Amino acid sequence: PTKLETFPLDVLVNTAAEDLPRGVDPSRKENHLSDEDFKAVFGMTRSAFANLPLWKQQNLKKEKGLF
Incomplete structure (x- = not known):
């Protein structure tokens, strides 16, 4: 594709x-959420989340079922 594929939060x-769609990086499921779902789930911009240390990004994702 021309950009990363997005899928509903419940699917990710x-x-x-x-069974995960081929277009989803299992280690970076958040990149495959729509902007709206990313905002609802994380409450910060994608850049702000990316600026958190990797271990903290992972810890937040674990509770949210996205790890």
Whole structure:
């Protein structure tokens, strides 16, 4: 594609690894949320989230089912 594919939050959270769409980086599911879902889930800009240390990004994602 011309850009990364997006999918509904429920699909990214509640799908077995083997069933995940091919267009989703399993280690960076947040990149595949729409802007609206990213804002609802994280409450900060994508750049602000990317500026958190990787371990903190992961910790936040774990509770949210996106790790």
